[PDB]
Design a protein around this ligand. Sequence first.
Ligand SMILES: Cc1nnc([C@@H]2O[C@H](CO)[C@H](O)[C@H](n3cc(-c4cc(F)c(Cl)c(F)c4)nn3)[C@H]2O)n1-c1cc(Cl)ccc1C(F)(F)F
Ligand SMILES: [Cl-]
Length: 138
Amino acid sequence: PLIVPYNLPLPGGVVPRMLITILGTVKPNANRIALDFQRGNDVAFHFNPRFNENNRRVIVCNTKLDNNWGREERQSVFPFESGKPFKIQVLVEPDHFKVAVNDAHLLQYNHRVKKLNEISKLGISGDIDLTSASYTMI
Ligand SMILES: Cc1nnc([C@@H]2O[C@H](CO)[C@H](O)[C@H](n3cc(-c4cc(F)c(Cl)c(F)c4)nn3)[C@H]2O)n1-c1cc(Cl)ccc1C(F)(F)F
Ligand SMILES: [Cl-]
């Protein structure tokens, strides 16, 4: 049981083969969740499940540079369920962030922010009970 919004420092930023694991439970009437990998004020990778966007569930991913959102990448495969425990794993690869939810591949997001060693914070927010947030090298 951790407080949301939650800040996970990523010391010296990220590097390929770094695996970030977030464990929590989706709240029973959830509307949205958001992971924000940040380079100072810029959002290198915003991962945002939306539970009711025009009565559809969709994963929206994007980057924010100089406070402007870029072109979104959308994924209709939606592995979250309100009220259930989840595990989100973000594997940093040389050209992409690879995301798997509950041990099933979900999507990949090409690096738009290229100074990986400056993406030094992961913000976790939205309609979840957060259990744990940590990282390791695979
Ligand atoms: C219109 C519209 N419809 N969605 C968005 C933005 O789309 C972005 C992806 O492109 C992010 O999801 C933004 N966002 C969502 C959240 C968040 C999520 C959570 F889950 C929580 Cl808990 C939380 F606190 C915060 N913070 N910023 C979201 O506001 N916009 C939007 C809104 C503005 Cl002010 C400016 C530009 C846009 C644009 F379309 F260009 F992207
Ligand atoms: Cl949103």
